[PDB]
Symmetry: C3
Subunit: 295 residues, 3 copies
Amino acid sequence: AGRFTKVAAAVADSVVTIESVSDQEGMQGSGVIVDGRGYIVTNNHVISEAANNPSQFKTTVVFNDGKEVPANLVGRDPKTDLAVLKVDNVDNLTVARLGDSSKVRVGDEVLAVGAPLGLRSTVTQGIVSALHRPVPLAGSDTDTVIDAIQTDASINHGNSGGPLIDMDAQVIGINTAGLGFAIPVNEMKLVANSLIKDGKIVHPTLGISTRSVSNAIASGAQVANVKAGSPAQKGGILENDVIVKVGNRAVADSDEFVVAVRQLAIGQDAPIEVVREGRHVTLTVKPDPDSTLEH
Amino acid sequence: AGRFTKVAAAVADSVVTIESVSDQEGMQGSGVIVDGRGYIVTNNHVISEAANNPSQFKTTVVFNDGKEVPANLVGRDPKTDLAVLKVDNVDNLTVARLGDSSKVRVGDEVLAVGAPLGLRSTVTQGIVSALHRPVPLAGSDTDTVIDAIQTDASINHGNSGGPLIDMDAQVIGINTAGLGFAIPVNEMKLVANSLIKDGKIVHPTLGISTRSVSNAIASGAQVANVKAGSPAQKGGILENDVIVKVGNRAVADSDEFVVAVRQLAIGQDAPIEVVREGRHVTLTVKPDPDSTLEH
Amino acid sequence: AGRFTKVAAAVADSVVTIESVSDQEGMQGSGVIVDGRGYIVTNNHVISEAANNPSQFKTTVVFNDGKEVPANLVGRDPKTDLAVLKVDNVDNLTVARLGDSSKVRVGDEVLAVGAPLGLRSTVTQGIVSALHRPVPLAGSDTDTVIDAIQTDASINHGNSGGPLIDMDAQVIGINTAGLGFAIPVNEMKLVANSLIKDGKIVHPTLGISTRSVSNAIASGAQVANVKAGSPAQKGGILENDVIVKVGNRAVADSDEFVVAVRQLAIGQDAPIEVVREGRHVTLTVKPDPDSTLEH
């Protein structure tokens, strides 16, 4: 048995096919079994239309034995492209061994595994090309930026939602196709634990719209709009400001700005560093929750 | 010597360059020596225009020693993108070791080798991404679907027609560029043995045109037209039927339908499973040969 | 530590980020430390606009420690996409171990390393797909053709200018993104030694414009124009001639013609082989320098 062939066969029983069908449509994706009680993690864009129109869509999970079982949506986060499904009273489930994405290093050989019984599924191979790389992701759901694992293994429709696997057959990331990018497993563990526990995930918000700017004076995220009543208006952030640092994270562009805001604590004061007409101004903002009732 | 470098040098003498030239055109591809009598396998689209216009095209085979020898066409199958060439009275030919594509597994490391003396030839590396994957292939020749080996190694103009090689330096597939796909070697061995022996290959036909459909009622290949006097008209297949199984093979789309029909026996009765206005109807059809005189 | 992870960490300190900024623009690339006195090699298109407008652009080199140091341009060759930068009075520099690209073979595993602190940098993995492959490269600088190492590792904006690394952590090529191609290290060593020593590099010229032609009569580079007073006019080269050999190198297309001319000696007589209306004519041309004052 080949070295990658061995690793792929070991995780195959943990990867499932997710089929969402209507009367005149269908959609397939991949998923990962992360808990023996039937908890399945996929990315949000696989199930997005079934969540926005649950009256006309049916979502089933197809195991690698050919077994087809109905699925129920526990929760979903469009801001990290993550979702949690639940199959009830299924026994002898082979659960995936989750790893530590903080122990991953550039050059490590990886496998991007898709669901074996998927229609046009794929298993691709490569190395980790970059770590902590902000990447923008684009139905009626919002566009977001994740701080992702980059790989030269092909991520596509056939392995999206499946796991990124290290050479110890451990899940280190969730492939997303929304050249290849994956959601780190530690990020996935937080979002999934919150979605199982509450059915929702509350992310910080500041009320700022930004664009990217890079020159010899100051480089970062230029404020394009400040919302009314927002924490930014209360903190002093003005339009045409250039945010260069959000909390303890430097901001090189509007994409890293989105990631750094989600790393702030809700309700706690935070430093925001800004270049205003050639002067460095340090502002203090208190992030608000994006969902007040669920929080 | 590197691990892939060793395998590539071992098969290099078995891979040849195929050049087809006219008075105002040219075309190059790759080929594989499969028999010591001078039998060379390539894919049909490398030589297609030389076969349709033999009066104005000259086809030569260039070995890896720089030796250039005229070639003659034994036969070609546009439905599997395969062709067989013959060089006469060439000695000390290094023949490729053919493998068993039924012993190939997802994750196995492969090499897509092109002709070393080709103008813009390539040697690429990857793994087997999927097995038994139907893929459509598109001059005056017909479009077809093959049940192929999928790989994340790049298949392109520089290695099309050359071999897909396992880590034992064995040919397990024929690269075709008509992300990467290859014709399984067992499929290649059937087509080539028939083309050497008769100069033709007779494939089954039913007389059906189909399109792909996928919803919550029934998913498969929707009948778009039934030809007159066809086996389908005699068997009861009607338009707007949805074929879900052809013989012993389930059909998920019009592409798998084309592959499954070619797996039927000519002249023997076969079951065809159909969803007609919400009712499952099982029909019996007898496949006809696509070429009656050559059969 | 993984096998590629080990090699990548060993060369990381030798790879630097090159940032060129203006008042309303910026540009980043990668570079390689090749000499302890502060000599950095990148490709010409990373710094092209800073060289054509030095009054409005500032070029800095960012080491992997976070240290930012101003850089000065020693020289640049647009015809090989190579450039040499100099940082002054920087100590404890980890210099890259340069290899021999003549000892490289098809199938050898390689790494295309980018600057670790680069904004959107990449480390990709593959094999050498082809050797001595002419590839055309396209601001106000000239388009050129280099005789390059081809690899199936992805070369992109994140690793352009960085090194192509073998499994002994040795630089065997310079990645250029102007599927993947790299400048051989032996070619790089000549150009860099001349650029350090004189600040310029003098390449041969003949005064010919060519296009590619391939048919059954003769294949090669068809003369599209002969410049006045050029060495070609003095040697007898006429328009619509087909150059098939330049010196000791055969010419299959206009791209190999550009490479072969740069391999001739300046001021020495050279054979040029031409097909003129069905007759093979052997001409003698004396290459001129492209820069007479710097030579």
